[PDB]
């Protein structure tokens, strides 16, 4: 076409530090487990405040809030979604 512009993969990299990328891929990857929960597994997030004892608002800031979670909260949550976090080699 013409008035069809940059690919995102190129605009992401002109504008973000590879670590601001890495911070994000991860944010994103978490949002992504809560999306599966909602649409695929069928777990309302009120049901996951019960399975994990994390408060409903704490869970939804993983999707909507301005700041990053402390660590445990994420473990707890992923853990009922049946996932953990692992340390792996960078790239």
């Amino acid at each position: 076409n013409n008035a069809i512009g940059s690919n995102w993969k190129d605009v992401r990299a002109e504008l973000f530090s590879k670590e601001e990328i890495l911070e994000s891929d991860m944010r994103v990857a978490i949002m992504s487990e809560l999306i599966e929960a909602r649409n695929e597994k069928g777990i309302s997030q009120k049901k996951l405040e019960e399975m994990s004892g994390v408060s409903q608002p704490v869970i939804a800031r993983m999707e909507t809030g301005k700041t990053s979670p402390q660590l445990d909260t994420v473990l707890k949550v992923l853990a009922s979604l049946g996932k953990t976090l692992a340390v792996v080699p960078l790239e």
Binding site: A3, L15, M31, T67
Partner: protein
């Protein structure tokens, strides 16, 4: 996985990419919070298409959608096998979507054919 393209206009400037480097341009934790939130949501649109659901995406009118990071609103459209085009950007001031913004997206989807 789903490619995304910024709409370039006639002049040719990408308005959603114009707004982003202006987020970049400035300091303040708020600049970064926004900009991070946007960088999250487009990455989530790229990997998930529209089966992201809410809160990241509402359908609006016809083939115009909104991506919804914090209080920015980014109109995109479905595109070729199968992919999306981010049209332009605006900040929610209302609980009813300004219809003004939607025609401006329709007009941009227009330009996109040719």
């Amino acid at each position: 996985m789903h490619n995304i393209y910024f709409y370039k206009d006639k002049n040719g400037n990408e308005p959603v990419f114009d707004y982003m480097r202006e987020l970049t341009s400035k300091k303040g934790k708020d600049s970064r919070i926004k900009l991070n939130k946007i960088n999250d949501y487009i990455e989530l649109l790229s990997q998930h298409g529209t089966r992201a659901g809410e809160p990241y995406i509402k359908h609006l009118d016809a083939e115009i959608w909104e991506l919804r990071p914090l209080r920015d609103r980014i109109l995109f459209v479905a595109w070729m096998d199968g992919s999306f085009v981010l049209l332009h950007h605006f900040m929610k001031r209302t609980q009813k979507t300004p219809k003004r913004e939607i025609e401006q997206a329709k007009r941009e989807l227009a330009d996109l054919k040719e």
